[PDB]
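new request in #modeling-help
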Amino acid sequence: NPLSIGTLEEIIDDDHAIVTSPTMPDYYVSILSFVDKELLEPGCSVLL
Amino acid sequence: MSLQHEKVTIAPLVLLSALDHYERTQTKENKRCVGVILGDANSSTIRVTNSFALPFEEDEKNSDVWFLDHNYIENMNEMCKKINAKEKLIGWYHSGPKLRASDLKINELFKKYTQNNPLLLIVDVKQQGVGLPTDAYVAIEQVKDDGTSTEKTFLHLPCTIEAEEAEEIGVEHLLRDVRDQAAGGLSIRLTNQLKSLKGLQSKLKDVVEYLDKVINKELPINHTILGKLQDVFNLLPNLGTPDDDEIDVENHDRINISNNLQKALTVKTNDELMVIYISNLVRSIIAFDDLIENKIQNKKIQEQ
Amino acid sequence: NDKVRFIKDELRLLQEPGSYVGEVIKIVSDKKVLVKVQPEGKYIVDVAKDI
Amino acid sequence: LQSIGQLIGEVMKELSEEKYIVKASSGPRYIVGVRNSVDRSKLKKGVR
Amino acid sequence: HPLQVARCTKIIKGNGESDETTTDNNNSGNSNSNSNQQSTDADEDDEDAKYVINLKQIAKFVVGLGERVSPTDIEEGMRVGVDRSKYNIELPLPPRIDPSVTMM
Amino acid sequence: TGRDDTKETVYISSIALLKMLKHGRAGVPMEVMGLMLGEFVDDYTVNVVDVFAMPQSGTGVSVEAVDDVFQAKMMDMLKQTGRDQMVVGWYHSHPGFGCWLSSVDVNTQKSFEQLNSRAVAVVVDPIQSVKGKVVIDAFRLIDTGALINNLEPRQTTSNTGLLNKANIQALIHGLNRHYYSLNIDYHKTAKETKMLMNLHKEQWQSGLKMYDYEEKEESNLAATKSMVKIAEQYSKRIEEEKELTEEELKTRYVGRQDPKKHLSETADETLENNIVSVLTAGVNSVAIK
Amino acid sequence: QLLEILVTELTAQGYDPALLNILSGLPTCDYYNTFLLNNKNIDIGLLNKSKSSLDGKFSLFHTAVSVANGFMHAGTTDNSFIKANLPWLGKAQNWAKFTATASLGVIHKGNLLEGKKVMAPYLPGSRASSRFIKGGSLYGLGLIYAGFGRDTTDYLKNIIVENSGTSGDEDVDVLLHGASLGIGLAAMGSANIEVYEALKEVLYNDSATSGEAAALGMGLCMLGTGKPEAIHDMFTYSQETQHGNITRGLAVGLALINYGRQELADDLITKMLASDESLLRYGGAFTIALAYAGTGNNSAVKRLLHVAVSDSNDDVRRAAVIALGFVLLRDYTTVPRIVQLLSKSHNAHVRCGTAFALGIACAGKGLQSAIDVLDPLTKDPVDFVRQAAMIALSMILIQQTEKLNPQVADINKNFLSVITNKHQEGLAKFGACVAQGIMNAGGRNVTIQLENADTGTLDTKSVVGLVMFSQFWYWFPLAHFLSLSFTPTTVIGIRGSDQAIPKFQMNCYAKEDAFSYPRMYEEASGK
Amino acid sequence: EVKRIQSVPLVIGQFLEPIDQNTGIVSSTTGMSYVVRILSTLDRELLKP
């Protein structure tokens, strides 16, 4: 708590992803939880 | 070289540090805690910013024997420039309260780490004085008058506690006492005014005693004291001049303004009285109503 | 007693930290709501004990 | 390293002898104090 | 994670940048040395190709060489991951989103 | 079992409080490092007697931010003056952030735990402190084994159990997975207090000291006019003021920011001031001559 | 004291062994045990809900529930606590475990024959795991045999000289904290000088927890002596020793010694409030309390009132208020007038001590006026104000039916409500649980009697109960001393010819159901 | 105590509107729109605009 809105720009094939936040920075993040990269697709809004 | 030490501001860090340091060596019974003081020097205002102990011994059999470790002073310098380069050796604290002549010779030593004359900061740790928890003196070398030689001597130069801003925050935190002298309300300053008269009076009593011992017990005439006393007699208020008379007129001018203010409050205080009696007036009626209203309540239970 | 107590209670509110201000865009299914915090970005955040 | 940098603004408006509206370069407008060291004869509006 | 993402905007060589400036002149120090000709006061600094990155809040920093890759792999116009606050390349990122786009 | 694992009452002396504030405020906007020297007694009492500041580090606070040359030398100097104590903890600042340990600071606590397992980590903000009670909190690690198997709480027994806490943020996350916070207890004697109260002999000399009388007349002048102008403001208050509900009158006739209260304060400051001025003058007359 | 010297004189005159046995105290214990044994009302449903809310995974929660239920089942040996709370007792750790072993010493109180036997498998030399269990049994023994057994004292004295040659080990310190409290109780009012010397060694180690325990244990024994050797030793040793847990205990310990000394303690009191240690001014407040207790003195009321307001420490304020109701014990109806100002206060600690003060003062019998005062304090948003008010309420209105006085009805539901909710704070939760334990103690047939009304004279034991009870913030298990202040209230017919209890019936002009037991606190299967 | 917070250093903001007498809504010059508590015995007879 709290959870920041994100956006999924792309998936990197090693269980990672490139995401772009509503804050000016962008970030290299890990894919975690019950939501996988198979269950995600690029351009979808995601909880970080 | 400079003879500039006219004002000595003390951070409260220095007085509590000297209190600790005496007790971390455990000196007693006219053994002393001699350590360094750091700050800024070569300047009209000295700010005494910091204090540290040094290795030091004090012999009671001869006062010209003490120990001091020189290598300690050189090693402490290296370290303190890294923390803060605005800190440098400016002289030495001495536990006191008794100033001695052998202390002039310790003084010479400290004149080899600082360009200015070293400041010897007497900090009483025994807390015998109710005022002066700092007295400051600086060794200067001068031809003394009255056929007297060149003497090396410790002259008093003004000091006051003023605190740094960064220090302040903690001073506020640790003072949680009501403060008998703080300069507060009417009350606080009537306590002060009395305290102030007994302060001065005792200070005046030392002057009397001193003077007697010069011609009784043949103390050395120190003509500096005596010069100051000529001006004491020369700044005496003299009555019957138009100045004193204007001052008595001014006491009425001031009491005049006090009188108008006192009336103005008498109206506020009476305003408060009026306003309560209105409330009580209403309340008489509200309490009366309860008695009627019961009947109305009782009747319902019976019906329903 | 009333007066001294109040002057201290308002000081206590200052010392404890700021607040912000959002508007609820939608309700989400963990008992949190999607807020758009008006001067910054969105934050998904838990209900109160009164709300 | 022990002297440390300082911040620039400009006196945006005089509030008091001992209070000034400055506009910081970093960002926010501030009310600041006047040091013993800086004299108020030097201070005025629009000076750096 | 998080490595804040930056990108190389300049290859400034580490022996051409003049990190030392006591005996070294700004134009270059030796081009393959910076303070290996100084061992009279013991200070060590060489490195090869330190890069200037540009953060996405638009702040520029001289950052480390790769600490989990060789610097050969890091190039001009290549995105990179740098620490939260310690700003030093750990992992490179591909040079943009260019693959697949071009190939269509 | 094993360790008691109840969080210490940290007793910071007056010297150690002021010293920390001194090194922190000079150093802003930067972090500061330092080691805390004291004595540990009982099973939950640490007395932090003194501190020393570790020079400013070029990488900031980290696990390399103690150089062993300074450290060894510094403690060696305390040993030559008998001021020696044992490292019982460490202090560090965040200059712009309230009290908590970042990832690096917790990892530093893991190192200090090795040396003494009751160690404290104290976080001092130098500028956010205006009281000087505030933004100083101490932390001490609770065992790792304790965390896993849910035997983590055991800090609420053997203390007062009065706790003082705020913030979720980093602070709270730090707490759950690692450390436990407890307030800073201040120890002093009446010799340190006594030194503070005095501020020379010019404290009391000033009570006799009388200002320019040019100033007194000016202050009294301003105040006279002020009371007329606020009496008129008060006249508006009693213009009628008999309509219903007290709250609607307060807003309407400006009973909020009351003119009656304002008159009262103005009068009293002036009345009492002139009381002291007449008294000190009269004191002066009789005393000198 | 008065009993002991009278037994010796009558055996030496020559007297019948019935009267002699009576004074020794064996029959009185036995009659009141039988009363508990016969009329007790267990509520299992309180235990299981109490348990559930206030899990034993949390150390502060473990403490509240343990104390509550110890009072709940008090005075008779019982299996209700042990069986119900069997996985929950195993859930303890650290000093919550110590509390839990000593919770059995409340439960098992009296039953004199069975007394050694019941604590036996938990003793040293029968226990070999948990130092907390080894320490809390000796304190549990001490409570059972409090003010009774002169046999018991010797066992504990053997342990004490065993364990005060060792201080270097943590085990030895926890173990000797429970011996040292136990012996004080067991020899309470004995004024025996041998007990003093044994525990002076315990004080002298500079142990964290056995030093506080020893300070309290020595004053219980030298209760009301005003011996000047004791008066010198403990005061001096507080300057010397700068461990704050020991210093606190010596101060309360001195308050104990100088009970009923009046203005011959006026000299000791001066020095305690003139101290610069916050510990000594706190214990100065109970020095006035106990010296002038139940007795009108001008010095006493005026000085506490001054101390409460003026001081620049917050603990010392809190304490002086609790002290005020001890001075104004007999005049228990005048306490709400004075402390209205202190309820209204801006100071949290002032307010905390106000609730405790009514608590104690009006403890002895119902006083509605007090309740009217404490109703705002219940709902106060300071947490420890809540904790203090929740507790106090139940002591004033002790073991009266929810029907007899409606105010009891509200007060019970308010303690329950707090326990159901989990958004409530830990301090609030402590007080609620504990207070419910104070309501429902002893099978519901026990009251707190501040004085015995056949003579109208103060009971020595009870006064000393409440001082330790009140102090629990700084050392959680001292709640247990409340045992001494509860007394079963009952008429017991006795044969003057066989010394056995007859059954027969009496006329009592009464209502039919007003003075019956309260109803139950269980319902969760209705869902 | 309050007098110190009252005094410098300060950051300027801009009063918007009240939302309650003792909590108002402002926007700071740092760029952050904050709900903020209002200290009492401030002129609330000019604060409202």
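bot summary: The beta strands of chain A are 3-12, 16-20, 26-30, 45-47.
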